RNA sequence: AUGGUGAA
RNA sequence: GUUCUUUGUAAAGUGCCUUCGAAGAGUCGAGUUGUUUAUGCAGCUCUAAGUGGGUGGUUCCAUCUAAAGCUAA
RNA sequence: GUUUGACCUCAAAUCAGGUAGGAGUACCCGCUGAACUCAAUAAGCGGAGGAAAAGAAACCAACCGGGAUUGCCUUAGUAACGCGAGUGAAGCGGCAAAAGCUCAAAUUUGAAAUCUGGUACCUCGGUGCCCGAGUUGUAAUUUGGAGAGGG
């Protein structure tokens, strides 16, 4: 059994998700026409364009719980983030620019660094291949010798270069590399663990915003936070 | 405030709200042992119009007493025997019963700094108030020592 | 067996009715000791180197809020069910009633303190509120007071 | 002698307390009298008192409301057991050579629900120190690359510490929590070792560091045997670790260039691939000229050729 | 009579 | 006497205009049973009023506000 | 969400801060109380101080009003009783001394403004900080002589 009040809730959030999603897909629609015309904006813009960058991309729980949307969902499965506390790097792109905006509201982006890309590499990676269920870390560099360096990758420094560097096995190996499933915060529950995460949500309204409009800057935050 | 209600409500006992409250309180204060603390009095206004204060330093007493000298004295001395270093300033009944009669006494507690630092109640800490139920000077032994107004050898030097 | 005037508690205000009334009862949750020192603190820091709207809280002290009552200032009266002098809230529901104020009736007089910062509280009431106490108020009628109206039965 | 359930009640301290009361002392063999009653006396234990007392007073907040008052609520280091199991740094510098094994391990452990970020950032911090002033004093003497690591081993005033270095590679995750009692300990006690380091190597302490330069490699490369390779710089392919080469080539004096530096005197060039296009190197080389001084030319360390046999410097 | 003393 | 402080839209009194404006319950009382120097007290059933009540003597009048408490001489 | 904390109650401490026993007892305050109406005497019991107790009228008064309590003279060996043995006062009058008063009682609600304990300073205490008591009522404002709000 469940309240009245949540089945409410879900469906108002629902409501609006779908809104939002439906007014920015139609002005991206016409944006990319070129009409520009008769729409509140064409050009683009970042405050804190389209140009390629690296950028390291979150999977942040919430907003309430609102039913799986099929844009939103899809294109979250593409970039297979379903699972919270995921990330995975992308390759920015003109086309993958609106994408930015499609999943704003369930992710937090930002332009990642040198040392914080070598730290995750060494720290985290996944290799979910041989039944094959086994999820082996990067222990040693003879399966990248193996399986990769088909394209001179044979190393954890070739993928880390790679990554920053925008190289041709990029696709490859962020595929291989099975995107690394990254600590949640607090992590506890509990007497401390309580009043750590009533503080630390104050942080989350101030930083992870959504002005819902169509028009609305992409949302961008350094990733030292992590 | 609460107490003019308070009041009015207590001046009929024989109401059927007060006489379920008793019958029902009867029976706890029976399993309850002969002289046991009360956390709090159960007539507050009747307290508080004898003086009594919720601040701290002040004790509120409970006990039993056979039915068949005055009952409110005995009680009053026998929770002073106990409470050697307590104050018997007043009691009061709350509850009756057919073989035993009950009535709370608060008391003072004159060692308290917080008694002591108070002029209303600093009179009390003096030594010439010592074991006052004893010597009946509460409102009860004055009653029985009939200190009421109105008419109810020596040979000089020439 | 309980005569008619009591037992009037443990019939209480049922849980969805309760629980928004205490959380419209949080949202003008009374200064603490704590937070008034320091606003305190701050205005004399701030007048000593280099006038704002009436506050509203809750109301919960026993003679001010019977006090309120009889004047018709208390828009709502929520009263505990555990109290241990029964006297003391025996009378607070009919003279609510004869003043024409709503009421009601929870369980748990620690829980009605909690939102008051008071260890207990026995009884709370309002002055002030924003348009929510209006339809509680209605709610709380409609489940208690009409539907419940007859209280003085049973025993 | 008590037993150590009569010991504990004694004390009538929760076993999961005691476990760190006994660790900060240390306690064994049941039980002499003597040290239980030496333990009770301790200050330690009103802390610990204080620190249940702040916790229950808490949940208590936390469970009435008003969380204002739980942030309100919220307004300690182990020196004395320092000074009583070190009664003198060189006996602290003695205790270091296995006590700080659990810190180094600890510097590259993944953050997790049984570690906090804070201790894992705090470890690694420790190492930035710790590399720091063993490249200032140039007392490295051993760099054996063992399969658990490149042992180094650094005459820390004659004491030889044998702390090991564990790979960079993840280090996939026992009871963390004696584990993270240890590596409290270890870090308070390493605070005060620091301190006295620096003071004694001359440096203001603590010294300015450099942020962009920690962006791009993360490491000893900020926070601003010894005659080998006077004055060297050497080129690091994108096979070998800098981390540890660059260490070693500061300690001695000279210089390193990372070829992910954008992800001249240039001597040599470390370079482990088949294919290459400087003196080219394999990484072998530096670590036997370092564990011996010999400086041997880089004719016996041609790339693509057989290795020698590495016997352990011990 | 009051209050104590002891004994087969 | 001598002094360092005197303070903050702080406190009090008095006459004028105006509006408000409480009182100690198993207690007084009553009947009985024991004590008392025909007062009072005690055990007990009953136990109430607030232009109300307690004590008195002349056709119903005079005074006071009890059932809480402190206080040198 | 079968986990939890509050509130209420019941226990424990070689824990911290506190107090009563006993003695003296002429005087004083209550209980009990014997015999040659004797006598509310003696003994016994419990409790205190330098005095104790009482003390500011639900008093006496029938006056042209007095006006906290207690002692002396007088009232008076009178009223009254047992008219019989014996008991036996009180108002008024004069003398020595005089003092007042505090809470329940009506909203501090535009701010529990109150206070105990622990800690750091200068110490028959004061300041900051922390906890606790407190709303089932801690400060000022009102105790019938009335008293409160305002201009």
């Given at each position: 059994?469940?309240?009245?009040?949540?089945?409410?809730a879900?469906?108002?959030?629902?409501?609006?998700?779908?809104?939002?999603?439906?007014?920015?897909?139609?002005?991206?629609?016409?944006?990319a026409?070129?009409?520009?015309?008769?729409?509140?904006?064409?050009?683009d813009?970042?405050?804190?364009?389209?140009?390629?960058?690296?950028?390291?991309?979150?999977?942040?729980?919430?907003p309430?719980?609102?039913?799986?949307?099929?844009?939103?969902?899809?294109?979250?499965?593409?970039?297979?983030?379903?699972?919270?506390?995921?990330?995975?790097?992308?390759?920015?792109?003109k086309?993958?620019?609106?994408?930015?905006?499609?999943?704003?509201?369930?992710?937090?982006?930002?332009?990642?660094?040198?040392?914080?890309?070598?730290?995750?590499?060494?720290?985290?990676?996944?290799?979910?291949?041989?039944?094959?269920?086994?999820?082996?870390?990067?222990?040693?560099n003879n399966?990248?010798?193996?399986?990769?360096?088909?394209?001179?990758i044979?190393?954890?420094?070739?993928?880390?270069?790679?990554?920053?560097?925008?190289?041709?096995?990029?696709?490859?190996?962020?595929?291989?590399?099975?995107?690394?499933?990254?600590?949640?915060?607090?992590?506890?529950?509990?007497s401390?663990?309580?009043?750590?995460?009533?503080?630390?949500?104050?942080?989350?309204?101030?930083?992870?915003?959504?002005?819902?409009?169509?028009?609305?800057?992409?949302?961008?935050?350094?990733?030292?936070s992590? | 405030?609460?107490?003019?209600?308070?009041?009015?409500?207590?001046?009929?006992?024989?109401?059927?709200?007060?006489?379920?409250?008793?019958?029902?309180?009867?029976?706890?204060?029976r399993?309850?042992?002969?002289?046991?603390?009360?956390?709090?009095?159960?007539?507050?206004?009747?307290?508080?119009?004898?003086?009594?204060?919720?601040?701290?330093?002040?004790?509120?007493?409970?006990?039993?007493?056979?039915?068949?000298?005055?009952?409110?004295?005995?009680?009053?001395?026998?929770?002073?025997?106990?409470?050697?270093?307590?104050?018997?300033?007043?009691?009061?009944?709350?509850?009756?019963?057919?073989?035993?009669?009950?009535?709370?006494?608060?008391?003072?507690?004159?060692?308290?700094?917080?008694?002591?630092?108070?002029?209303?109640?600093?009179?009390?800490?003096?030594?010439?108030?010592?074991?006052?139920?004893?010597?009946?000077?509460?409102?009860?032994?004055?009653?029985?020592?009939?200190?009421?107004?109105?008419?109810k050898?020596?040979?000089?030097?020439? | 067996?309980?005569?008619?005037?009591?037992?009037?508690?443990?019939?209480?205000?049922?849980?969805?009715?309760?629980?928004?009334?205490?959380?419209?009862?949080?949202?003008?949750?009374?200064?603490?000791?704590?937070?008034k020192?320091?606003?305190?603190?701050?205005?004399?820091?701030?007048?000593?180197?280099?006038?704002?709207?009436?506050?509203?809280?809750?109301?919960?002290?026993?003679?001010?809020?019977?006090?309120?009552?009889?004047?018709?200032?208390?828009?709502?009266?929520?009263?505990?069910?555990?109290?241990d002098?029964?006297?003391?809230?025996?009378?607070?529901?009919?003279?609510?009633?004869?003043?024409?104020?709503?009421?009601?009736?929870?369980?748990?007089?620690?829980?009605?303190?909690?939102?008051?910062?008071?260890?207990?509280?026995?009884?709370?009431?309002?002055?002030?509120?924003?348009?929510?106490?209006?339809?509680?108020?209605?709610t709380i009628?409609?489940?208690?007071?009409?539907?419940?109206?007859?209280?003085?039965?049973?025993? | 002698?008590?037993?150590?359930?009569?010991?504990?009640?004694?004390?009538?301290?929760?076993?999961?307390?005691?476990?760190?009361?006994?660790?900060?002392?240390?306690?064994?063999?049941?039980?002499?009298?003597?040290?239980?009653?030496?333990?009770?006396?301790?200050?330690?234990?009103?802390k610990?008192?204080?620190?249940?007392?702040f916790?229950?007073?808490?949940?208590?907040?936390?469970?009435?409301?008003?969380?204002?008052?739980?942030?309100?609520l919220?307004?300690?280091?182990?020196?004395?057991?320092?000074?009583?199991?070190?009664?003198?740094?060189?006996?602290?510098?003695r205790?270091?050579?296995?006590?700080?094994?659990?810190?180094?391990?600890?510097?590259?452990?993944?953050?997790?629900?049984?570690?906090?970020?804070?201790?894992?950032?705090?470890?690694?911090?420790?190492?930035?120190?710790?590399?720091?002033?063993?490249?200032?004093?140039?007392?490295?003497?051993?760099?054996?690359?063992?399969?658990?690591?490149?042992?180094?081993?650094?005459?820390?005033?004659?004491?030889?510490?044998?702390w090991?270095?564990?790979?960079?590679?993840?280090?996939?995750?026992?009871?963390?929590?004696?584990?993270?009692?240890?590596?409290?300990?270890?870090?308070?006690?390493?605070?005060?070792?620091?301190?006295?380091?620096?003071?004694?190597?001359?440096?203001?302490?603590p010294?300015?560091?450099?942020?962009?330069?920690?962006?791009?490699?993360?490491?000893?490369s900020?926070?601003?045997?010894?005659?080998?390779?006077?004055?060297?710089?050497?080129?690091?392919?994108?096979?070998?670790?800098?981390d540890?080469?660059?260490?070693?080539?500061?300690?001695?004096?000279?210089?390193?260039?990372?070829?992910?530096?954008?992800?001249?005197?240039?001597?040599?060039?470390?370079?482990?691939?088949?294919?290459?296009?400087?003196?080219?190197?394999?990484?072998?080389?530096?670590?036997?000229?370092?564990?011996?001084?010999?400086?041997?030319?880089?004719?016996?360390?041609?790339?693509?050729?057989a290795?020698?046999?590495?016997?352990?410097?011990?």
């Amino acid at each position: 059994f469940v309240r009245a009040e949540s089945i409410v809730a879900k469906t108002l959030a629902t409501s609006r998700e779908k809104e939002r999603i439906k007014r920015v897909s139609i002005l991206e629609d016409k944006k990319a026409k070129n009409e520009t015309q008769h729409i509140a904006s064409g050009k683009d813009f970042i405050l804190k364009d389209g140009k390629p960058a690296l950028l390291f991309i979150v999977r942040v729980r919430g907003p309430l719980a609102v039913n799986i949307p099929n844009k939103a969902f899809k294109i979250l499965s593409l970039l297979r983030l379903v699972e919270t506390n995921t990330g995975v790097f992308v390759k920015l792109t003109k086309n993958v620019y609106p994408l930015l905006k499609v999943i704003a509201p369930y992710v937090v982006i930002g332009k990642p660094s040198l040392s914080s890309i070598r730290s995750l590499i060494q720290k985290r990676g996944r290799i979910i291949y041989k039944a094959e269920p086994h999820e082996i870390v990067l222990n040693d560099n003879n399966i990248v010798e193996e399986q990769l360096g088909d394209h001179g990758i044979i190393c954890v420094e070739d993928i880390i270069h790679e990554i920053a560097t925008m190289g041709e096995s990029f696709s490859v190996c962020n595929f291989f590399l099975q995107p690394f499933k990254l600590n949640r915060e607090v992590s506890g529950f509990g007497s401390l663990n309580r009043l750590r995460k009533i503080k630390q949500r104050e942080a989350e309204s101030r930083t992870r915003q959504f002005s819902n409009a169509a028009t609305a800057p992409v949302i961008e935050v350094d990733i030292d936070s992590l | 405030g609460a107490y003019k209600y308070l009041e009015e409500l207590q001046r009929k006992k024989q109401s059927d709200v007060l006489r379920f409250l008793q019958r029902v309180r009867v029976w706890e204060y029976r399993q309850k042992n002969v002289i046991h603390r009360a956390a709090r009095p159960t007539r507050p206004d009747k307290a508080r119009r004898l003086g009594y204060k919720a601040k701290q330093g002040f004790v509120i007493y409970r006990v039993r007493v056979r039915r068949g000298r005055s009952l409110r004295a005995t009680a009053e001395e026998r929770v002073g025997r106990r409470a050697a270093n307590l104050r018997v300033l007043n009691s009061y009944w709350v509850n009756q019963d057919s073989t035993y009669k009950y009535f709370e006494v608060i008391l003072v507690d004159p060692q308290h700094k917080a008694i002591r630092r108070d002029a209303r109640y600093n009179w009390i800490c003096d030594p010439v108030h010592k074991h006052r139920e004893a010597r009946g000077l509460t409102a009860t032994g004055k009653k029985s020592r009939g200190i009421n107004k109105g008419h109810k050898l020596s040979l000089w030097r020439y | 067996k309980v005569p008619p005037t009591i037992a009037q508690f443990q019939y209480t205000l049922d849980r969805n009715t309760a629980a928004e009334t205490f959380k419209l009862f949080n949202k003008y949750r009374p200064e603490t000791a704590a937070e008034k020192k320091e606003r305190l603190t701050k205005e004399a820091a701030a007048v000593a180197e280099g006038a704002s709207p009436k506050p509203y809280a809750v109301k919960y002290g026993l003679n001010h809020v019977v006090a309120l009552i009889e004047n018709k200032k208390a828009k709502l009266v929520l009263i505990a069910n555990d109290v241990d002098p029964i006297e003391l809230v025996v009378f607070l529901p009919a003279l609510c009633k004869k003043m024409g104020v709503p009421y009601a009736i929870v369980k748990g007089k620690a829980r009605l303190g909690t939102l008051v910062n008071q260890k207990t509280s026995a009884v709370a009431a309002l002055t002030e509120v924003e348009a929510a106490l209006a339809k509680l108020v209605s709610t709380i009628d409609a489940n208690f007071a009409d539907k419940y109206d007859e209280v003085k039965k049973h025993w | 002698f008590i037993t150590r359930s009569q010991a504990v009640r004694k004390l009538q301290v929760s076993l999961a307390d005691f476990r760190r009361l006994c660790i900060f002392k240390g306690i064994y063999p049941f039980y002499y009298a003597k040290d239980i009653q030496y333990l009770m006396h301790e200050p330690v234990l009103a802390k610990f008192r204080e620190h249940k007392t702040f916790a229950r007073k808490l949940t208590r907040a936390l469970g009435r409301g008003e969380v204002s008052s739980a942030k309100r609520l919220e307004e300690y280091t182990l020196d004395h057991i320092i000074k009583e199991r070190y009664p003198s740094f060189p006996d602290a510098i003695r205790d270091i050579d296995d006590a700080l094994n659990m810190l180094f391990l600890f510097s590259n452990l993944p953050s997790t629900n049984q570690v906090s970020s804070k201790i894992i950032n705090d470890a690694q911090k420790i190492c930035n120190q710790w590399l720091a002033y063993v490249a200032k004093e140039r007392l490295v003497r051993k760099v054996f690359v063992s399969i658990k690591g490149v042992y180094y081993q650094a005459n820390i005033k004659g004491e030889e510490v044998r702390w090991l270095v564990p790979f960079k590679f993840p280090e996939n995750i026992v009871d963390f929590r004696i584990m993270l009692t240890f590596l409290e300990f270890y870090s308070t006690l390493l605070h005060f070792v620091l301190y006295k380091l620096y003071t004694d190597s001359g440096l203001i302490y603590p010294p300015k560091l450099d942020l962009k330069k920690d962006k791009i490699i993360s490491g000893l490369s900020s926070y601003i045997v010894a005659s080998l390779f006077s004055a060297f710089v050497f080129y690091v392919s994108r096979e070998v670790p800098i981390d540890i080469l660059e260490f070693l080539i500061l300690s001695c004096g000279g210089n390193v260039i990372s070829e992910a530096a954008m992800d001249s005197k240039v001597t040599h060039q470390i370079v482990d691939r088949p294919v290459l296009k400087r003196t080219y190197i394999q990484p072998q080389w530096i670590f036997d000229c370092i564990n011996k001084g010999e400086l041997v030319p880089a004719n016996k360390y041609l790339p693509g050729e057989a290795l020698p046999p590495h016997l352990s410097p011990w």
